[PDB]
mmCIF file with all atom_site columns, C-alpha atoms in Angstrom:
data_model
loop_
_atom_site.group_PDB
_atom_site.id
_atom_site.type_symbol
_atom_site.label_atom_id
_atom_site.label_alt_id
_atom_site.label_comp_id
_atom_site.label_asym_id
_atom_site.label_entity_id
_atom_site.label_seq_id
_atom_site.pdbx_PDB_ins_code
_atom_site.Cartn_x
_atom_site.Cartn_y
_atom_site.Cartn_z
_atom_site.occupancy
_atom_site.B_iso_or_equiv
_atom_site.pdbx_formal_charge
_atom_site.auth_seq_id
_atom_site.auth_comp_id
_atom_site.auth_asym_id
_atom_site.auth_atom_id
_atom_site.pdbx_PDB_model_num
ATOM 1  C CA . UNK O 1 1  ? -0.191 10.322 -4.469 1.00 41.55 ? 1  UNK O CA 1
ATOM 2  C CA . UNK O 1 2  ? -0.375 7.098  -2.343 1.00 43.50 ? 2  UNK O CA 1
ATOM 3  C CA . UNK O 1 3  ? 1.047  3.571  -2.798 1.00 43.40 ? 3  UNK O CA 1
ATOM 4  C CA . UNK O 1 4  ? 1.901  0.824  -1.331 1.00 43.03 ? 4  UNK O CA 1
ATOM 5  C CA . UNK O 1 5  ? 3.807  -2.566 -1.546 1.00 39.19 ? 5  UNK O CA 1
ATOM 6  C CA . UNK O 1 6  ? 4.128  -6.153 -0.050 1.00 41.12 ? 6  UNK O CA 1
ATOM 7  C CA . UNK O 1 7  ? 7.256  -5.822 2.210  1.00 39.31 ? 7  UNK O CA 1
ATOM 8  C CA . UNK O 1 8  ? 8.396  -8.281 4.413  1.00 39.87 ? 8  UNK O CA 1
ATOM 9  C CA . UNK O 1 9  ? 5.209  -9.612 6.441  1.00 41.62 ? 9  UNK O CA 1
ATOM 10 C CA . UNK O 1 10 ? 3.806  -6.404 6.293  1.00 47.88 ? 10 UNK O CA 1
ATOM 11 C CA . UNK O 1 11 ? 2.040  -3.943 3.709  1.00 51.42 ? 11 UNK O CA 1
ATOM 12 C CA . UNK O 1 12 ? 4.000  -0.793 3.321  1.00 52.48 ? 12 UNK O CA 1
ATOM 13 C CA . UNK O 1 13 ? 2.185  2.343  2.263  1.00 51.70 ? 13 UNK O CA 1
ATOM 14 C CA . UNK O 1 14 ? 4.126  5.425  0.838  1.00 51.81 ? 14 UNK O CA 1
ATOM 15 C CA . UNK O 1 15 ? 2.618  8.628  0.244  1.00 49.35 ? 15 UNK O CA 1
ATOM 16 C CA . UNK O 1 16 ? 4.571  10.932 -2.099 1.00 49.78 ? 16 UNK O CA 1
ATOM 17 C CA . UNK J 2 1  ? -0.782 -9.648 -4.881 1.00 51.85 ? 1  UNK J CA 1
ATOM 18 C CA . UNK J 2 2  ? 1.299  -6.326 -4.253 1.00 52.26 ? 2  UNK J CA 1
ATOM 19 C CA . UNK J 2 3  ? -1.309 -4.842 -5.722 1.00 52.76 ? 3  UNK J CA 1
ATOM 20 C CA . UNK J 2 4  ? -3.354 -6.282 -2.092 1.00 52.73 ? 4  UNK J CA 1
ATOM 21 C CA . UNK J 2 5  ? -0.824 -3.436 -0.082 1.00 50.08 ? 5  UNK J CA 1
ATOM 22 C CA . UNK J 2 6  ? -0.983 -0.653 -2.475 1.00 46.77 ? 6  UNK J CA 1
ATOM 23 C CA . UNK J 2 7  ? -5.308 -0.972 -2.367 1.00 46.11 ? 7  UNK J CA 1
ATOM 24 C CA . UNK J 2 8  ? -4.971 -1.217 1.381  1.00 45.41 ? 8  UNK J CA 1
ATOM 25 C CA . UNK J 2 9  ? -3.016 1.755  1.754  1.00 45.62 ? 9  UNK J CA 1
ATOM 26 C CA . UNK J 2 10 ? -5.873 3.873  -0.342 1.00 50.04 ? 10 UNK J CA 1
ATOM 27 C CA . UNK J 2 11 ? -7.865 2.292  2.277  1.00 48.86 ? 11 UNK J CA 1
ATOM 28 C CA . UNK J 2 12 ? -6.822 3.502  5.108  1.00 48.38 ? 12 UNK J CA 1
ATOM 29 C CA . UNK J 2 13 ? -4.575 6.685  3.712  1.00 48.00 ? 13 UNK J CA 1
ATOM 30 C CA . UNK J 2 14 ? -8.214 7.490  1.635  1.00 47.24 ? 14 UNK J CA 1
#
């Protein structure tokens, strides 16, 4: 699974 | 608008 979020100035992507 | 991060990161982790 991969998602991501809006964190900080940047786009964080988290693959579980 | 998060939503913008999370379909990047399919994007690139695609």
């Amino acid at each position: 699974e991969v998602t991501g979020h809006i964190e900080g100035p940047t786009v964080t992507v988290h693959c579980k | 608008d998060d939503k913008d991060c999370d379909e990047y990161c399919k994007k690139t982790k695609e």
